Amino acid sequence: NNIENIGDGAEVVKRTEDTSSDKWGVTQNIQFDFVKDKKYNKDALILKMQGFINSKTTYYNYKNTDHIKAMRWPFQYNIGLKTNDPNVDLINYLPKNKIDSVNVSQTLGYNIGGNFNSGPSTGGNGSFNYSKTISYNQQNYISEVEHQNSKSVQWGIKANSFITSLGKMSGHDPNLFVGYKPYSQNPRDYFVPDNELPPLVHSGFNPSFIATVSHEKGSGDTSEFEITYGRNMDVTHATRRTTHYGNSALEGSRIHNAFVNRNYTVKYEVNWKTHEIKVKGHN
């Protein structure tokens, strides 16, 4: 339906899937680009994983106590791709290396014969028959590949370094996001305002990741892929201790990994012969 000629007898067959979950607060917008090149001895599929993961940050009374309030927030965003097809191999993924740049912008370039290049989106690596670019912001967060093998890749985009009213804080600091004194008994009012929170905490994350897989020609028409987007959430408790003597400022405590793997997983079936992509299921 949507095919691009990429020169020298090759073409790219493009398909996009877009699926949202109100339950998980996730949109997976996936681009599936089949590279049809007679000069490359395997079938190739480039996946560009975009969409949005809501932060799902919430505020509540800890055990409905009078003076302990809680903030549930995304310590890490999860992006993962996996297959169970023995005929498929993961051949590249971007970003490949740990990266803390506020903006991550990279390009995967393809040249006839199964040649792939990873480099800056600004170029300087050469001319390609086809290319795909990723771009995402991750202010105060850091991206890393948590694991990768021939069948899967998982990234974590985690809370890293913050500028607070008390100076620099790591993503593990128990006082992170805790206010000075409550403005009211509303649980929100024990934590700093939205302007003092990064977009990844107040709003969410706009992923932009690439993975390329190869498939043995003539080995089977279909493969299943599971793509997972989600969050691992931490809880910060802020406690107001009344004293006529010391510091009555709020004190923070952290429950690290309070609600892990809150993920939306979608199973996609890829047909290497027809180029039909279909959703097989989801949670």
Residue numbers in the entry: 2 to 284
The authors write:
With the exception of α-hemolysin, which is homo-heptameric, leukotoxins are bipartite toxins, formed by the non-covalent association of two distinct proteins, a class S and a class F component of approximately 31 and 34 kDa, respectively, into a likely octameric species. Panton-Valentine leukocidin (PVL) is associated with necrotizing skin infections, such as boils, and plays an important role in the poor prognosis of necrotizing pneumonia. Two additional structural domains are also found: the rim domain anchors the protein to the membrane surface, while the stem domain, closely apposed to the core β-sandwich in the soluble form, contributes two β-strands to the pore β-barrel. Since the binding of LukS-PV to the membrane is a saturable process, the necessary presence of a LukS-PV receptor on the cell surface was thus proposed. This was recently confirmed by Spaan et al. who showed that the C5a receptor is required for the binding of LukS-PV to human neutrophils.
The mutants exhibiting significantly decreased binding abilities with respect to wild-type LukS-PV were: R73A, Y184A, T244A, H245A, and Y250A, with Ki values ranging from 1.8 to 6.2 nM, i.e. a 69- to 238-fold increase compared to the Ki value of wild-type LukS-PV. Four LukS-PV mutants (R73A, Y184A, T244A, and Y250) displayed significant alterations for all measured parameters, i.e. at least 50-fold decrease in affinity for hPMN membranes, 2-fold decrease in the slope of Ca2+ influx and 2- to 10-fold reduction in pore-forming capacity. The Y250A mutant crystallized in 5% PEG 6000, 0.1 M sodium citrate, pH 4.0. Crystals were orthorhombic, space group P21212, with cell parameters a = 85.30 Å, b = 84.29 Å and c = 38.09 Å and 1 molecule per asymmetric unit. Crystals diffracted up to 1.55 Å. In the case of the rim domain, wild-type LukS-PV and mutants T244A, Y246A and N248A displayed only small differences, with r.m.s. deviations comprised between 0.20 Å and 0.30 Å, whereas the structure of the rim domain of the Y184A and Y250A mutants were markedly different, with r.m.s. deviations of 1.10 Å and 1.28 Å, respectively, when compared to the wild-type LukS-PV structure. Of particular note, the rim region was generally associated with weak electron density, and could not be completely built in most structures, except in the case of the Y250A mutant. In the Y250A mutant structure, the removal of the tyrosine side chain allowed the displacement of the N248 side chain, which in turn drove the reorganization of residues R241–Y250. Space was therefore provided for the displacement of the V179–Q186 loop, which adopted a conformation close to that observed in the case of the Y184A mutant. For both Y184A and Y250A mutants, crystallization was achieved in different conditions than those for wild-type LukS-PV and the other mutants, resulting in a different crystal packing.
